[PDB]
Symmetry: D3
Subunit: 112 residues, 6 copies
């Protein structure tokens, strides 16, 4: 029952693939426990997912940060052309998730 | 540039298919202009989509309200077992969208 | 909790799409309660699915018997070229399911 | 072994979905017997497909010409926002296919 | 023309993804030469696939045994949360396949 | 704005997966700037794609040349059984692309 924070950035959002991102985390077995879109820069989509090992799990679904090293099968592998146009972020530890979760989301918005 | 309101209801959400719903509206060409998840009953996901003819458009993606009449290819066709366990709602007119958009979303949350 | 019988016929099986068939019934919410493949003519795959309204449900996933009338979104719509090369069968009533279930499957094989 | 002519028009091509179109005709069982892209207006992708009943078959995969009437599961259902932004064409008869095939393709390009 | 044994375990089966598994092996080019579901613990789905190099092939489709090391694109990558909740098994050699094939399947059930 | 040359070879083409190939390059963000099919040996489909880093990009979508080493998520991973029956080719450098582009395509056919 850890939790992690994922966000889909503007270009990602202009391309139309938070659906994709959500589908992959759903498919992998994680519960979506919060989500919202935020307006400006560029709009972004913030999410929080919960599951056994979801922080390491989530980073693996996303693929390597550097899209030039990201393998097919991951989000960055399948979708992202350049590190700027990577357009996705996930927490890198259980510690940083909590900072990101608690910064971006009112607790009323999360789901226990 | 009309707009419509779509929502994915609890069981829908327990099954894991707002990704699916979002992917179909993305794929169809509509801009997602707001979205958030709301906690209790059961949690729900509210969205607003914008495009030429999106209110009639959106209802067609969803399929007939009565899942016993919903054809494959639509969300209710592909996913929903019973009218209770239909678990999806879309505005039925441009008029009702505005009531639903303006009830469920602060305008800061929408995107002009 | 009705049940129905579905079968994927030889050409269907030479084309490689019992996966597809199973995925659509899974996606729709039905429990797979038996399944096996049978060898000769041509091999075939027999299945039994269970759910609210699954007999009418299942026929709708399959699409119209006459592939010339089958719409996209259904199995026959998406996959089948001719009525011979339709290659799929589903029960047409709750009555005929039981004859088909109980003929093709030992009860040890079904799952209560 | 009829044949038909399909073409994916500029916006279609700017959106990135001749893959989709080709995948659906492949999936349905038709042989692709010619194909090429043509540059200007806007670029377009011309194809020829062959199979039992492929002219009526192909129009059905595409869905109704008027995207406001096109059901989900078809290309126009799933992808096209307006009749201008429909962006796809298929032959309406065995007669018109031959005019379209023989106009757009050198016979060296087709495949017997 | 080697053969291998694959099985989808209970939780896998409660989640609804033998379709997925079958689709990936079909897509990869392997012939499905036997298959059946078995009832209790938890029900399971046994399969046998045949093709050039299918034993090493099949393990690669499944991904690393330890779901914490399984990359996206594989079954365990895309679907499995924990090593218990990995829920899939494939033969590790041509030798062990034969033990698994011949244990789990009557030869009448296989297809030469 | 580099460019690369991709080609789908006969068996690939008999299996029906230039759609797949095109869909993956589209999905990854590359512009398709030329494409055509060529008749005999076996027919083949030639394409040219353009984007930031598309030559290395394209080889990564295809996966390792030796299908016995190709991971799931790539084309060769997901689809190809043997190195002969690999059936796909992509340029290995910006230099070799230009030789392949300029050999296989009249410049009228490319798109600036």
């Amino acid at each position: 029952s850890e939790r992690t924070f994922i966000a889909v950035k503007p270009d990602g959002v202009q391309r139309g693939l938070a659906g994709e991102v959500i589908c992959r985390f759903e498919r992998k077995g994680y519960k979506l426990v919060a989500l919202k879109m935020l307006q400006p820069s560029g709009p972004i989509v913030c999410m929080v997912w919960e599951g056994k090992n979801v922080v390491k799990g989530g980073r693996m679904l996303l693929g390597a940060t550097n899209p030039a090293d990201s393998h097919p099968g991951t989000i960055r592998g399948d979708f992202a052309v350049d590190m700027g146009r990577n357009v996705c972020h996930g927490s890198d530890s259980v510690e940083s998730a909590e900072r990101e979760i608690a910064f971006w989301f009112k607790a009323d918005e999360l789901a226990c």
